[PDB]
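lol forgot to send this yesterday, sorry. struct tokens for the thing we talked abt
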């Protein structure tokens, strides 16, 4: 069972992606106070009527997601080969993967300590009850939490985490892509980097079938993407919803 060494080029790709992530993911969440403030209405009963009437957490979470899409755009532009694509394909890939990369990158704030995304003091701790206060339902939130825990338990090296985000973005099978072959060539270069990295740098037993497990998470993300889109559609029917979102969020999901 051969373990070819990482090529000079593969090493450079990993370094570039690590740098890209460090430049676009602030692990202190220090910008979050700039978003519209979180508001948490009394909703212990999980009332859909109340949740939709108030959408109390939506301005804050929409601002968080919008900010994150901006960061993902920056990250993607640094992926080796991404700028070789036409502008049209770049935008198709970004719009189709945005929610999935947000879900992946959020794993860094997610904690199994209490099953929350913890981004600072209580104000910026986001729980399932906060997501329902933004107008989403359990059919999305429950599998989202299951996804976060499963990803956590893979114990990815940062190298593997950034590669997975890059592979997710540069996917040839997104609707509307023009040069699928070029996209696939870029993705293959990243996939080969990841497979090679796992085999020579990830110790047992966590390395066992790890690449397959990571590829399965990409399939899981497609499912969550579809469910999020259905739910966003419903949310959009609420009068005055657009003011609680952002122009970027409206474009990506509308
Ligand atoms: C973003 C990041 C973070 C959390 C992501 C969350 C927590 C709150 C609920 C969110 C935002 C989920 C929620 C279902 C969601 C995603 C998009 C939307 C809207 C409200 C736009 O429909 O709601 C998806 C990702 C979840 C914090 C930090 O890790 C940065 C990361 O980019």
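and heres what i got for the seq, position by position
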């Amino acid at each position: 069972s051969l373990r070819p060494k990482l090529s000079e080029e593969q090493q450079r790709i990993i370094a570039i992606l690590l740098d890209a992530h460090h430049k676009t993911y602030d692990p202190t969440y220090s910008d979050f106070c700039q978003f519209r403030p979180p508001v948490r209405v009394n909703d212990g009963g999980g009332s859909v009527t109340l949740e939709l009437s108030q959408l109390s957490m939506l301005p804050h979470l929409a601002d968080l997601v919008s900010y994150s899409i901006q960061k993902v755009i920056g990250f993607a532009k640094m992926i080796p080969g991404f700028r070789d694509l036409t502008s049209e394909d770049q935008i198709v890939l970004l719009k189709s993967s945005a929610i999935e990369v947000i879900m992946l990158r959020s794993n860094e704030s997610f904690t199994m300590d209490d099953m929350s995304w913890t981004c600072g003091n209580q104000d910026y701790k986001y729980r399932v009850s906060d997501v329902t206060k933004a107008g989403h339902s359990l059919e999305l939130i429950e599998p989202l939490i299951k996804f976060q825990v499963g990803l956590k338990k893979l114990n990815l090296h940062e190298e593997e985490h950034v590669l997975l985000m890059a592979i997710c973005i540069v996917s040839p099978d997104r609707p509307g892509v023009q040069d699928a072959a070029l996209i696939e060539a870029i993705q293959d270069r990243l996939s080969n980097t990841l497979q090679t990295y796992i085999r020579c740098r990830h110790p047992p037993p966590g390395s066992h079938l790890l690449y397959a497990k990571m590829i399965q998470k990409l399939a899981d993300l497609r499912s969550l993407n579809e469910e999020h889109s259905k739910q966003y559609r419903c949310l959009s029917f609420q009068p005055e919803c657009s003011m609680k979102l952002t122009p970027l969020v409206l474009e990506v999901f509308g």
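Residues 1-254 form a domain with the Retinoid X Receptor fold (CATH 1.10.565.10). anyway ping me if u want another try
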